[PDB]
Amino acid sequence: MRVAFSAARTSNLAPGTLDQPIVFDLLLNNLGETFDLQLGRFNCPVNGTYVFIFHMLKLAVNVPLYVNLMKNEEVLVSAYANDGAPDHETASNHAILQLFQGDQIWLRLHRGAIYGSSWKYSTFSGYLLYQD
């Protein structure tokens, strides 16, 4: 197939509660129309091997940033960022995994808050490497 998305935050995301989905407000790309910006979720259209990458810039405040890459309800990989000045800092990670159709991939803001601007520091992408 052909599946690829790239989303960014152009405004701050500061959730009321812990463990909320990171939703996005700008698509850089949505080849295959698999990503929903308003839920921040990737909906796997076909069984195959997929790559995901994300970079999240934290607010310059004295709260650490914890981000999980989620597969449905499971933690796949996580990222951490914190600076005590306080300064902005970047939580990043990646994953390559076999998915089944209907699987949902998303970013969970476990703790902290994420910076957004037109310069788009905070990003989330994925694509299909191998079908099957």
| Residues of the shown chain interacting with its own copies in the complex, contacts defined by CB under 8 A | 2, 4-6, 8, 28-29, 31, 49, 51, 53, 55, 57, 68, 75-85, 87-88, 90-98, 117-121, 123, 125, 127, 129-130
**Three-state secondary structure call for residue 77:** strand
| Helices and strands, counts by H and E, the chain | 0, 11
Say which entry of its own copies, Ca ion, none residue 111 contacts (CB below 5 to 8 A, set by partner kind): none
Between 41 and 94, whose beta carbon lies closer to its own copies? 94
Q: Which residues pair with 43 in a beta bridge?
A: 104
Judge whether 83 is annotated as a binding position.
yes
CA–CA–CA angle 24, 69, 66 (5° rounding): 85
Between 53 and 61, whose beta carbon lies closer to its own copies? 53
Q: Report the alpha-carbon distance of residue 103 to residue 80 in Å, rounded.
A: 25
- Least distance (Å) from its own copies to the CB of residue 29? 5
If one asks whether residue 83 binds Ca ion (CB under 5 A), the answer comes out as yes
| DSSP for residue 13 | B
Q: Could you tell me which residues are annotated as the binding site for Ca(2+)? A: 83, 89
